[PDB]
Amino acid sequence: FQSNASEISITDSWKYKAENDERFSSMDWNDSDWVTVDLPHTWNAGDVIDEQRGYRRGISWYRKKLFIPSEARDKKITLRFDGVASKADVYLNGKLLKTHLGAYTAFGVDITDICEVGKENLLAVKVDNSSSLGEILPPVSGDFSIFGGIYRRVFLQWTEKVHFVTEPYAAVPVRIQTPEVSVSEASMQIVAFLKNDFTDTKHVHVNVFLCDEMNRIVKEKQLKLKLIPGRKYPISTSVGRIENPHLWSPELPYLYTVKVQVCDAKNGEMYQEVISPVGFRWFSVDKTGFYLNGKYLKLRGAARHQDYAGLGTAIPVEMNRRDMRLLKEMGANFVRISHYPQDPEIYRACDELGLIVWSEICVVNEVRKNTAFAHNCKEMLKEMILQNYNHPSVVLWGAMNELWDYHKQAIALARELEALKKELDPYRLSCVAFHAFTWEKPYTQSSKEMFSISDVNGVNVYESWYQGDSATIAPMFDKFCSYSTAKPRFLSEFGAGSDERIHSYTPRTFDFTPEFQLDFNRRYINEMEKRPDYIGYSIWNLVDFQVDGRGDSKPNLNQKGMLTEDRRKKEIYYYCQARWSDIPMIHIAGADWTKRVEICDDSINVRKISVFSNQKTVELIHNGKSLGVREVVNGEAVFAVPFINGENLLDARSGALSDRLKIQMKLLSSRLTDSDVLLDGLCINLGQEHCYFIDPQLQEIWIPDKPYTKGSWGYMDGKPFNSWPGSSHDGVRYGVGADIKNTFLEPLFQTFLIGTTCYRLDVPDGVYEIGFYFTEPFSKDERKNIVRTGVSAEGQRVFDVSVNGEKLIDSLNLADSYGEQTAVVKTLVVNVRNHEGLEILLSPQKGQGVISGLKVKKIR
Amino acid sequence: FQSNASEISITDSWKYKAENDERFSSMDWNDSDWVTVDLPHTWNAGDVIDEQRGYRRGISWYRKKLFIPSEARDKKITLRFDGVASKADVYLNGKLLKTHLGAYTAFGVDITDICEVGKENLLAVKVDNSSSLGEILPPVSGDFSIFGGIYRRVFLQWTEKVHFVTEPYAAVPVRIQTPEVSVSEASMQIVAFLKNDFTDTKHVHVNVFLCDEMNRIVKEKQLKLKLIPGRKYPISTSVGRIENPHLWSPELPYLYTVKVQVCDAKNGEMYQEVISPVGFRWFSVDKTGFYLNGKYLKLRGAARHQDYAGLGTAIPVEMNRRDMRLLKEMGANFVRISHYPQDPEIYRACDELGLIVWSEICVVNEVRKNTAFAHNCKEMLKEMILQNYNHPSVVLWGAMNELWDYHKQAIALARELEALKKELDPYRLSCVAFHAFTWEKPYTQSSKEMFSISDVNGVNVYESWYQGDSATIAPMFDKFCSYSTAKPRFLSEFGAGSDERIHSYTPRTFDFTPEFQLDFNRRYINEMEKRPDYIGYSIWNLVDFQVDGRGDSKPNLNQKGMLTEDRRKKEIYYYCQARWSDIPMIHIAGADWTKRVEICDDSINVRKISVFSNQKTVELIHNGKSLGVREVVNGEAVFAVPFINGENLLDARSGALSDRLKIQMKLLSSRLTDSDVLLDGLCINLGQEHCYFIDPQLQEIWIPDKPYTKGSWGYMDGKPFNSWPGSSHDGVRYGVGADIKNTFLEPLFQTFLIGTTCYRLDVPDGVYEIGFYFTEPFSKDERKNIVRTGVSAEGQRVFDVSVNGEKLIDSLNLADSYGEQTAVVKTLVVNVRNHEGLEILLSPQKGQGVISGLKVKKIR
Ligand code: NA
Ligand code: NA
């Protein structure tokens, strides 16, 4: 059997404890009653998406009784770690073997003469995660937590004693560049390092075959040299004999095999045999576009985060190719590995499937004027490059992102990062990402020095979202080129958050409907495809991802994703597919909005509905009557659908293609005369006057509020809340951003009427379960803003609730009785006689009243 | 204002602790460090679906600072408890007020004398869950779990002191019967008691109205009577001929409304007004069928359990109507409320939608020979009936389900419970359900009285599932009439478990595919639709429900539902819709199977596919080509669909109806160098030779296993496990049934190869990851059987995995190094050189080996 085994996984049956005692490195310690976890693992997989603010930053320990197979006797035994969050202290049989810094790169551990091969050993890992590490290790801050743990795999490796120097940086056994390649003939110059950890000397043959994708050999190149024991000998060959090469592209992803056999001269033994995929391509950059192999190429894609729903970042490794395949089939050709490098699998995926890669490290938000800090940033960039190097998919090396002070050590550290990128990797480009707050540094600063470092400049534009409107967005793309005027631009991040529960026919900023997310990404794609100088752009983000602290619709989540945290495709995903993929498609938008309840007194509820597509034309049939053929423009065709009570079958057609979508639509008359709905429950989203919220647990649709008209329902006084004084949001963001405790229905409780003293519904006689949904929406410190929060001089809010003349909640104070921003529900049973219907009163004692929702059920 | 409140919820912000200290009732206790919950609350929502066998049966305490609005001052004030699992012990202001036995019925506590309107009061509930209670109170045992907590709502309510007596069973305030009902006229009898709790004497009119659905008074009648304090005055009036009443059916569930007021004849002040809906119907039973309102009605339905996924039985109250709507929309007219009485709103839902109700109390599995057990059943029969007295939907009252020993005191209690049903309410029918294990008591008792007590005899048949097969189904229904000779019969349970992840073209018993659950019910329907002496039949169950202990494909869940545990529809919910619902429909089987990957070398892969429908004909169009119009026989038309590789589109059409369903198929060659599975990874469910398994988290598809042929893969040795000694499953069921700790992929692990020693896989060259998925499949008790288990006579199983000569796992003891029935995943990186492919040896040092899974990925 000429085939050999190289590593065995060791991710199984570990003992974990959240406590910090230096005794836990002891062979002879008693870990019996520690929890038993399998790897990957992270102690913040739940900590972050909790209702408690903040997650535990600290130290924990992992112990493993680690056996070593006998086939690794007499060999050089190593331990590879693909990913440990922040600092790691690997102890073996009591004795500290290595320490590592950096949460995102792999690292090695030589255990050869320390371990007993055959017997059994104790492997102890102190894993640190503290906030304190920020004064010496990036990332320093940012919009992404760091789940602590050992969250990528761990393996036990062994090779022969004549071996390849990979340390201190877990670099790839042998680097391979392509210095000059074009449509004619190819060049490949390999770099490596053999070392003889034997007792004697050995004299080698070092063979280098380059085999087809069909593995028919195209070249040979055999060398020989003398390795004396302990000498670290440098190899640096080069071949250029390669005829009529098959070139790698994001469309045609052709990879080559470059075998390397190191074999004993007088003996015939094979000591090593690296094999590594390689790609032939070429590219460059300027304000005239991005070019690859000659032709023109616009880079189109997104950034990916390395976490999954409720798993922390201890993802199954198969996840990594699954995330990237969902990007490729979205129609992209580019991915932005941010804000940190990721699993070997990510990179392997993007050059087997074809995806140009942008790869940063986590110098995020700020630098620390600190001797030590800068050193680790370069030690980490040194690891990113040499660990992922023969990967043709990769094109740009990043390191900085969204700084807020390009100070002195900053700009110097900026230069040192570039010098060492093209030093290490001369045949790849470099990149950086600024934010787009031009009222802050580096735009308020003395100079413009920094925009003239890296080969491409990225910008993070969120106009129409965090501030600015529909109109300020092309002006924002403009004045960036004011600065990055030497080198070409790139759209780093852009995206709006969305929730598959909030829908609106008139979407506005920061209501989190997939509707607004659609218009956002359709204004941005139009501005970006027109300008070729911006060589590319990236959606932020491919995924929804979990960051502890973040609020809004799904609290402790970033919702700008194109996939949910569990990788279900949102409808923005299909829109992009229609503007990018060459693989024919059609899709009726609204698959996430299949049940609808809407006030309408006519027979017909006409509502626009759009069909995303690749083709030139789309036909749409409503209930069997075609609505006409229409041309697809910017991926989209918008029909006007005459919706009617009951089932609505919309079937879209265009050529050989199809999509179907059944929309259940319940027309509700404004007079409560004509409605079965009260027997089910009339659920009213108080303070929300332009969105429908659907709770997927009950399928309850929370219809929007309206002012009271005679014979119907609504409020009498009061206004829905939307004051954000001093932002683009004032009068546009309805409701607060708070996470609300004891409810999942955030879009319901966050919306509220303020100052409403009276609510009417004109219902028929009978018994009613009225249920009220309250929360104090404001924190103790924002309640110090007495006008905006409608509270008393001392910040209190006591009011009473009366129904039909009876005081029934006698002094409701939400904050001091239930906690601020905690959900409070009270149900009442009221018998309505005469034809009085329901008159609800909120009598303020201190401050002004608040209600988030109402539910009206006729129970008999 | 003539309107008034009655009740107000007190389910918000409670204090909770799982300790038992009697001081916990004291007003001044410091519950400051206790956790806050809102009701509905259980405390086994987690317990029941975790890995630890069992759940926590014990005592916990609730505390709530109870505020009493002044609107209720010097009125009669009651606490309302809709449900509290087993024993409650309610204290107010330190003083114990009520103790209550029984999880499933409501009780009431009077606080008018003890409470304090305007002060804070302290309301302590001690709640109790111990099996220790099963000796004095049912249920004793049974396929479900008693989720301790206060899991239904709780109300504080107030009346005026002249009030309808409700205690001791918290009955409906006026009882209502219809002794005579026909198309031309109906009679009506109302029953109530009155009490005066003032100091004065009061003279009161009683005003009885009977209003139609438009609330037009169709009958009225007043009664004069005077009430000296404290005396319990009965009343019982009749209402004369009602004339041409609108009857109640599951088709037309017309509902009237008995309005009963009690006013003061001297001034006119109104003391009470009680609104009570009713319907007019009449029914009977014989061996020729069920008759409702004069016509023959085949009763077709399903039972419903109380719980919802991850919420235990602390469901929100609206879920109750959501379930009943889903059920009516499956074509049911019948619901089996079992094994316990359920929420008030299940019964309000059922008689508004149109579903006839069989309603049981919870005397399951055995009757206890104690004087106190029997008494508590009587009092739980009283509580059920008196609380659900007026619901037109209830037609049958139950008490016992599946006894296993009809001993003397059992028959004595079947008798007093029928004697009691007819006493308290003579106008409804009576029912009971038996098991179908003819080899056990009571089918082997000398006597047969137990089969002659209550008016209808149900039977729970699982032939073809727990025992038997296709040949024994109909012979069983006949045997049940051998015993049910006087009273008619009913099919109260029948079902088969299904998993949405396991799919088979050749379904067999206990593989948990929906395609066997399909055939099962087909065979069952067809028999009932021709057996008129089975007046009706109810599927088991409407929902997957949560029960600790049960394992199989999804552990801790009873998987026999029409809907998933979160109320999503399975394939078979649509099959019932074909056979029952009178709403025209069409639907292609396989919406749970759109990703398929099969071994097939020709370009076309013919597979059979069903289309469910109401209609006489379906035409099916695959990829634009029509496959013809097939007649719909007994709900379905199967076709032979010629699947190609790639996207396949299926159009089913019937006049105006149509369903559409795309199916993605990956064809896989036998020879491994013909495709690219290896580059994502070949996932092979070893031990499973007829079901595919879609891991919904990675969307990977564990294909079945085939013995080895050359050029491809498969096992050289051994055999997949399927040994069930003495059972009908013997050879039929592959795998074991135990919960496999540490995974959610129980269909992958529970199946496995046994006694295999060699495994081949003729893959190209390159570097491979190979995962190994293991488990000790049997327990210590189960390994006492050396022969079925394949272990050493001391009970042990040790072996070494080796690949391509080299030994890597050094000697594995599964149940000793990691625990029995835990999941372990090893991963080698091995370098296939030359043309060796992959040899995998399992070498046993004790017993025979086992192995569940294989992933084979080509990484470079
Ligand atoms: Na609201
Ligand atoms: Na298996």
Residue numbers in the entry:
A (entry chain D), B (entry chain A): 20 to 879
Question: What are the paper's exact sentences on this?
Answer:
Bacterial β-glucuronidase (GUS) proteins comprise one class of gut microbial enzymes that have been shown to reverse Phase II glucuronidation and, in doing so, cause the GI toxicity of several drugs. In an attempt to gain insight into the structural and functional diversity of GUS enzymes, we recently reported an atlas of 279 unique GUS enzymes identified from the stool sample catalogue in the Human Microbiome Project (HMP) that clustered into six structural groups based on their active site loops, Loop 1 (L1), Mini Loop 1 (mL1), Loop 2 (L2), Mini Loop 2 (mL2), Mini Loop 1,2 (mL1,2), and No Loop (NL)20. Here we present the crystal structures of the L1 GUS enzymes FpGUS, LrGUS, and RgGUS, as well as the NL Bacteroides dorei (BdGUS), and show that LrGUS and RgGUS exhibit unique active site features not previously seen in L1 GUS enzymes.
To further advance our understanding of GUS structure and function we also determined the crystal structure of NL BdGUS. Like the L1 GUS structures, BdGUS shares a similar core fold with EcGUS, with 3.1 Å root-mean-square deviation (rmsd) over 528 Cα positions. Unlike the L1 GUS enzymes, BdGUS is a dimer and possesses two additional domains at its C-terminus. Sequence analysis revealed that first C-terminal domain of BdGUS is a “domain of unknown function” (DUF). The tertiary and quaternary structure in BdGUS is highly similar to that exhibited by BuGUS, with a 2.3 Å root-mean-square deviation over 816 Cα positions. While BdGUS does not possess a loop at the active site, as predicted by sequence analysis, it does contain a loop insert in the CBM that enters the active site and is not present in BuGUS. BdGUS and BuGUS share highly similar tertiary and quaternary structures, but the catalytic efficiency of BdGUS was nearly 10-fold less than that of BuGUS. Given that the main structural difference between these two enzymes is the presence of a CBM loop insert in BdGUS, the CBM loop may explain this difference in activity, as it may occlude a substrate like pNPG from being properly positioned in the active site. Finally, despite its lack of an active site loop, the NL BdGUS was found to be weakly inhibited at pH 7.5 by UNC10201652, with a predicted IC50 value of >25 µM. However, the CBM loop in BdGUS may enter into the BdGUS active site and provide stabilizing contacts, enabling slight inhibition.
